[PDB]
Amino acid sequence: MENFQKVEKIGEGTYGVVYKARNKLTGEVVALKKIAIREISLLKELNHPNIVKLLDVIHTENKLYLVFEFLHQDLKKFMDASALTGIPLPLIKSYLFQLLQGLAFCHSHRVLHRDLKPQNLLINTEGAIKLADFGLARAFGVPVRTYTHEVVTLWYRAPEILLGCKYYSTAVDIWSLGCIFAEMVTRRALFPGDSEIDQLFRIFRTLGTPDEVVWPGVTSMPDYKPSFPKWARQDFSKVVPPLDEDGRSLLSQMLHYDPNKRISAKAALAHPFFQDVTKPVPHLRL
Numbered sequence: 001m002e003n004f005q006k007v008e009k010i011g012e013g014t015y016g017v018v019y020k021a022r023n024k025l026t027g028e029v030v031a032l033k034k035i036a037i038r039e040i041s042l043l044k045e046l047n048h049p050n051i052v053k054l055l056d057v058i059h060t061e062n063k064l065y066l067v068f069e070f071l072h073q074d075l076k077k078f079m080d081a082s083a084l085t086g087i088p089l090p091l092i093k094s095y096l097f098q099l100l101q102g103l104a105f106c107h108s109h110r111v112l113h114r115d116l117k118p119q120n121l122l123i124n125t126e127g128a129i130k131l132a133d134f135g136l137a138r139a140f141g142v143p144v145r146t147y148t149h150e151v152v153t154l155w156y157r158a159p160e161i162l163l164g165c166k167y168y169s170t171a172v173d174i175w176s177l178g179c180i181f182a183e184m185v186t187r188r189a190l191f192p193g194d195s196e197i198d199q200l201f202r203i204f205r206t207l208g209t210p211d212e213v214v215w216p217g218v219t220s221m222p223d224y225k226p227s228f229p230k231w232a233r234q235d236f237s238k239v240v241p242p243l244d245e246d247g248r249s250l251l252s253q254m255l256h257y258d259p260n261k262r263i264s265a266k267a268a269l270a271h272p273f274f275q276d277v278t279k280p281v282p283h284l285r286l
């Protein structure tokens, strides 16, 4: 649209191209997504420090542009830049702290993300990290292949979604974040599934195959089969070295199979892992 000179293609998303753009009324650099209206108009109203601010919604000539605040880098790029040294733990801890603050905010207005991953986690030079694309998956889709036929990752999907629950809760977000948490620590994807049954089975081999004892009602889920192989749970000390006892208790609590048992975001901010949070500035050049 006309009020915006786009100055860069930032990237192909799930729903559209994103451009860095110079709003020439306000003069402000801004991120322009080219893509329900009741829904995405609702989002304009939920602003948190750790949620990427939806500035405007432009439905002109029956198209959809969403104008957001601009952040300089995403988490996935930053994990790749920090591959040989790893992200320092005080940084990992503070980023997790902030994310749970943002999750705790949306979850109380009953907005889920439900497609979290390193790629829609965005960071600035200050030491802040924000959550991007919140509320959109509800508004349209979360599809299997994007608009450019890229396969949407299954790596972070909560197992009740994989097992065919259609009434996900906010717990599916705490699941994903446990997966991103573990990955920030090991420098290696927790559950790197390449199909839905590979994803299911990758979870099972590590956490153990779920039954009626740990997960009440799993065996009557839509896509549960009695023929699932029965694997044994692994020790978290083998799964996420060198994470400490506090981190691992937290991580297993976010990775609980039963969604009712899985730790809430508000409760995670009170876990002893976060007793010593600081806010460090990260090493990042632009």
Ligand SMILES: CC[C@H](CO)Nc1nc(NCc2ccccc2)c2ncn(C(C)C)c2n1
Binding pocket: 010, 011, 012, 013, 014, 018, 031, 032, 033, 052, 068, 069, 070, 071, 072, 073, 074, 119, 120, 122, 132, 133
């Ligand atoms: C949600 C994922 C999106 C595309 O993969 N990434 C991205 N990346 C942004 N910045 C990453 C970046 C900044 C500068 C250059 C290259 C990439 C960004 N800023 C605002 N937004 C809105 C659309 C959420 C941004 N979105």
